Design a protein around this ligand. Structure first.
Ligand code: HEM
Length: 399
């Protein structure tokens, strides 16, 4: 059994193993870093089954849970938040924070999302690029999701830049382990003070609603509110930054689609749909253990065996998406959902917000900067390390 996770075939590509597995061995065992095994599921239909089966569990204290790194093993020791819960605890906690993320709430947030994007773009214009390229990640892809989720949580305007930098440090590949851990703990300490403040004087933000609706009645404690807020910050932010950067790179890579999007920014939603299928920047979250035996395809997954369901592979499943390795914003979509945001009850709480952020970026960026260009050869883009989820570290641009 091969070692898993697999490395990307190159900067912007999925691991090569998945296509071959879909063709010849769609449910198979892989070996994890600790020498344990897990079942890897690669076809769309089977990923959907894993994501929804009530015989499967997200609880990480179950033996057989497929932890993919030594640090994941350590993190599993902590009191879980809803990401690692099963019913009924999962929705009992998740519902405490869903209101901000509903399709209607996100529709009503659209002017705020647009203003945030516009303001960051204007800062970019003002800054200029007269002395050379600037980094689209630092100047734009990082702050857009950061400023939004921090604002929604309740962070005041003046603190956004510093906290945006610190949250990046947690996941920057250049950070040492000490630097990432200290940044982590610094955000938690910050959020704890915010919770203390909003308990005394609530404001119109997510932390305040947790404090008033859940802490004060004793449904959760202060530290739970901190951990729920934290989860909302860290679960999707780095993924959003990568999706923005990947979108810009992809448009540069396919000039005619860029031309089409510039000619018709109303194509942004379909561009974003294709982007979230093609670049599955969170590919390792659909993990389970079997609570009891479960058959998947021609395999029996026994009680206490782990499962990893690759949404990345599902999103390239030729049986569902015709010509799946083609990026086509004019894709004719099948009835089956793309799985960039996962599936089932755990499906990304922020899917509508994320798509709105991406749609706003891709319907605005080239209106603002119709001559935006990646300022290095596309073959020299600095992607995330190949043994990690797809993403881009920095992206020099001119405009
Ligand atoms: C384009 C950007 C994003 C992508 C591709 C993405 C993808 C995902 C994926 C694949 C999952 C796993 C769902 C499952 O278990 O089936 C997920 C879960 C989650 N995401 Fe995102 N996400 C994104 C942005 C966000 C943002 C912006 C936030 C927060 C504001 C967020 C917060 C979460 C949370 C809390 C969960 C766990 C939900 C649960 O287990 O109940 N995500 N996301």
């Amino acid at each position: 059994a091969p070692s898993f996770p697999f490395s990307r075939a190159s900067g912007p590509e999925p691991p090569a193993e998945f296509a071959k597995l879909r063709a010849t061995n769609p449910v198979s065992q892989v070996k994890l870093f600790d020498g344990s095994l897990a079942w890897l599921v690669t076809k769309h239909k089977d990923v959907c089954f894993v994501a929804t089966s009530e015989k499967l569990s997200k609880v990480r204290t179950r033996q057989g849970f497929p932890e993919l790194s030594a640090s994941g093993k350590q993190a599993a020791k902590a009191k879980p938040t809803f990401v690692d819960m099963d019913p009924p605890e999962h929705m009992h906690q998740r519902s405490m924070v869903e209101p901000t993320f509903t399709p209607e709430a996100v529709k009503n947030l659209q002017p705020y999302i647009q203003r945030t994007v516009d303001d960051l773009l204007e800062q970019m214009k003002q800054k200029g690029c007269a002395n050379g390229p600037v980094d689209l990640v630092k100047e734009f892809a990082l702050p857009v999701p950061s400023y939004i989720i921090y604002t929604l949580l309740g962070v005041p305007f003046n603190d956004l830049e510093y906290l945006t930098q610190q949250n990046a440090i947690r996941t920057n590949g250049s950070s040492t382990a000490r630097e990432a851990s200290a940044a982590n703990q610094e955000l938690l300490d910050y959020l704890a003070i915010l919770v203390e403040q909003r308990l005394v004087e609530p404001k119109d933000d997510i932390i305040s609603k947790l404090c008033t609706e859940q802490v004060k009645p004793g449904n959760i404690d202060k530290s739970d509110a901190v951990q729920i807020a934290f989860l909302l910050l860290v679960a999707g932010n780095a993924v959003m930054v990568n999706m923005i950067a990947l979108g810009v790179a992809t448009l540069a890579q396919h000039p005619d689609q860029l031309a089409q999007l510039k000619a018709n920014p109303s194509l942004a939603p379909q561009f974003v749909e294709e982007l979230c299928r093609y670049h599955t920047a969170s590919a390792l979250a659909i993990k389970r253990t079997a609570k009891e035996d479960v058959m998947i395809g021609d395999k029996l997954v026994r009680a206490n065996e782990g499962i990893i369901a690759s949404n990345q592979s599902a999103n390239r499943d030729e049986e569902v998406f015709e010509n799946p390795d083609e990026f086509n914003m004019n894709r004719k979509w099948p009835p089956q959902d793309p799985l960039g945001f996962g599936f089932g009850d755990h499906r990304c709480i922020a899917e509508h917000l994320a798509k709105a952020e991406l749609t706003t970026v891709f319907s605005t960026l080239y209106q603002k900067f119709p001559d935006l260009k990646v300022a290095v050869p596309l073959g020299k883009i600095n992607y995330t390390p190949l043994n990690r989820d797809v993403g881009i570290v920095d992206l020099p641009v001119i405009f």
